Amino acid sequence: QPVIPVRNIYYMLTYAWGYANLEAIPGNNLLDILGYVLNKGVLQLSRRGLELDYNPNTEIIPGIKGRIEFAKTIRGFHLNHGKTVSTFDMLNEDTLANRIIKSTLAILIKHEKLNSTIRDEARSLYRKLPGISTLHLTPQHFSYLNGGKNTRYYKFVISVCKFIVNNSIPGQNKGHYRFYDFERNEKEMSLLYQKFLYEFCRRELTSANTTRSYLKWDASSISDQSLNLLPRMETDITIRSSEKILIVDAKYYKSIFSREKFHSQNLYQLMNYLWSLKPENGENIGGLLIYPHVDTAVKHRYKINGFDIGLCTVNLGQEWPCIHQELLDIFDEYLK
C-alpha cells in the first residue's frame, strides 16, 4: 500500500497554487508540514505587516467623526442627547482574509494527530490576534475572496487554509479534528497531478507556449448541431511550440504503482483528441502519456496510427530537484 513521501507532495501543491525549508521538520505526516508553513507564514507576514482595509463605520457617537449623516440623526433625534449618526472609516485587521486565518488556527490546534510544537506555537499566535473575530469556515467564505485584492503572498497562504478546511474530519472527539487521508484518493491526486503540471509547464518551459485547448468533434449530426449528448472534450494540457505541437494526457492510478497488466484506458481519450485537433501550421503532432511510479522511471515511444506517442513514468520519492531534472529532461525528448 505505497504512496509518495509526504514532503514532496507539498511541492506539487505549490505549483498547483502558483505560489522554504522542509528538511528541518521531523514530522513525516502532512499536517505537520502544512501547519508549520502556515504558522511560520503568518509570522513572515506579520513582520512586514498584516493587511488593513478601511472599513466604513456608521454609528452613534458623542461628536463629529468623519461625515455626519443628517437624515439618521434627525430621525432619531440624537441631537437632543448630544449624539450624531456619523460615518467614518476605521482601519482594522478584522477583514475576511484575516478572519479566515485565525479561525483556521483553531482547527489546526483542534486536530487530534499533530506535532506538539506546532500545536503550541499556533496557540500563541491565536492569542496574538485579539482584535480579530473567529468564524465558522465554509468555501463560500473562500468563494467571496476570489477577488484576491490581497498580495500574492496572502493568496498562497489562503489556499493552504482551503486545503485544510475541506480536508479536515472530526475524529474521536466532538470538538477536535482529524486530518483527511488525502493520499488514498486518486481523483483529487489526479486533479493535483494535472494542475501541478499545467502551472509547472508555464514556469520551466518558457521556450514553448503552454495552453489548455478545448476540442470540437469533426462530426455532423442531422438531429442536433449542439451535440450535447456527445462527451465533452477538453485537453488536460497542450504545450505548443514552433517546431512541434504536443498534447499530454496524465492521470494518477494506483494500479501503475505496482510494477503484470497495465491500466492505460486514458489512451482511448487521447487518440480522439489527436483526430479532432487540426493544426494550421501542420508541423507535426505528438502525444504523451506520463504517470507517477514509485520505484523507477521508464520511457517508451510509439508510432501508432501516423502519430508519435510516448509513454513515460517518473520515480517519485527520489528527490525533488532530480525529479525537476527528470521532467525537463523528458519533454526535451518529445518536444523535438
Binding site: 437624515a71 430621525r75 468555501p139 463560500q140 476570489n146
Partner: protein, 290 residues
C-alpha cells in the same frame, strides 16, 4: 382588464401565474424570487390590474427599497419644518387608508429590491398586522409615533403585498428571517425554453433554427451555472430580457444582433462569474459565437 392583453406577450407558462394568483388571494404576502431580466418587475404591474380587473393607478402602488428607506418615510414619522418637527403620514399608512374606503376592491403594494433594506427597520411593528391571518380592526395597534393610544392602525384585508427579490448577490444567501415567515417565495424560471419567447422572435422575422439553436446553448449555459453552489447558485442564471429589448426598430435577429449582446453584456459578466478560469470564459464565448 383582459388576460389576453396580460398573458399573450408573456414568456411565463400560464400554470405558474395561475398558481401565483391562487396564493395571492389566499395569503396576500408574496415574493417573486428570480434573477434580473426575467420580467419580475414587468409582470407585477400587470398582475395588479389582473386582480382588480381594471387599469387603475390609485389602487396599485409601486416602490423600490434601498438602505435609505425607513419606517419614518414608509409608515409615519416627523419631518422638519423650518425649525419644528411635523408628523407626516407615510406611504403605506396613506395607501391603506385608501383601501379602507373600498374593502371590496383589491389594493396592491409592490416592493422591488426588498432585500437591500431590513424589513424590520422599515416595517417593524406592522409586521404583526401584515401577516394574512392577523388582519382587520380586531388586531388594531397604536403606533410608535401615535400621539395617543386612541389612534390606531390595522392592515385591511383587501391590500395585497408583492415583493420583488433578485437572487443575484452573495449576501442574500442568508435570507432575512423577517421575510421567510410572512412571505411565500416563488421562483421565476429563465424561460428560454418556452413557446412564447420563441414565438415572440418568430413574429419578429426570425429563423426557427437560429432561434432553436440559441435556446439549447442558453439552456445549456444556465444549467452549468446552477450546477455550482459555492459561487453561483441556480438563482444567478441568465434571464430572458437581454434578447427581448433592442428589436423595436424591427431589425431582424441574427448572429450580428446577437453578437452585440454577447460582447457588450454577457462577455464581461462571464469574466466576473468565471474569474478563476479565464479559459472557461473563452470556452463559452467561442461556443456562443459559433
Amino acid at each position: 382588464y383582459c388576460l389576453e392583453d396580460a398573458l399573450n406577450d408573456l414568456f411565463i407558462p400560464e400554470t405558474t401565474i395561475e398558481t401565483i394568483l391562487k396564493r395571492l388571494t389566499i395569503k396576500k404576502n408574496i415574493i417573486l424570487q428570480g434573477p434580473p431580466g426575467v420580467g419580475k418587475t414587468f409582470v407585477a404591474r400587470r398582475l395588479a390590474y389582473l386582480l382588480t380587473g381594471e387599469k387603475a393607478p390609485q389602487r396599485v402602488n409601486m416602490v423600490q427599497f434601498h438602505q435609505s428607506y425607513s419606517y419614518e418615510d414608509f409608515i409615519q414619522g416627523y419631518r422638519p419644518n423650518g425649525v419644528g418637527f411635523r408628523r407626516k403620514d407615510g406611504i403605506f399608512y396613506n395607501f391603506c387608508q385608501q383601501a379602507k374606503e373600498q374593502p371590496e376592491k383589491k389594493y396592491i403594494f409592490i416592493i422591488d429590491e426588498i432585500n437591500r433594506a431590513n424589513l424590520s427597520k422599515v416595517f417593524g411593528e406592522v409586521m404583526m398586522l401584515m401577516e394574512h391571518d392577523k388582519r382587520g380592526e380586531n388586531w388594531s395597534v397604536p403606533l410608535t409615533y401615535s400621539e395617543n393610544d386612541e389612534e390606531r392602525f390595522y392592515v385591511p384585508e383587501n391590500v395585497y403585498i408583492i415583493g420583488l427579490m433578485n437572487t443575484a448577490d452573495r449576501s442574500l444567501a442568508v435570507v432575512d428571517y423577517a421575510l421567510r415567515r410572512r412571505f411565500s417565495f416563488i421562483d421565476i424560471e429563465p424561460g428560454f425554453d418556452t413557446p412564447q419567447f420563441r414565438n415572440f422572435l418568430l413574429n419578429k422575422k426570425a429563423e426557427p433554427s437560429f432561434v432553436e439553436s440559441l435556446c439549447q446553448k442558453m439552456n445549456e449555459l444556465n444549467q452549468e451555472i446552477s450546477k455550482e453552489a459555492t459561487i453561483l447558485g441556480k438563482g444567478f442564471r441568465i434571464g430572458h430580457s437581454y434578447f427581448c429589448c433592442g428589436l423595436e426598430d424591427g431589425t431582424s435577429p441574427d448572429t450580428q444582433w446577437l453578437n452585440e449582446i454577447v460582447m457588450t453584456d454577457i462577455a464581461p459578466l462571464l469574466e466576473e462569474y468565471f474569474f478563476d478560469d479565464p479559459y472557461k470564459q473563452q470556452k463559452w464565448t467561442n461556443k456562443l459565437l459559433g
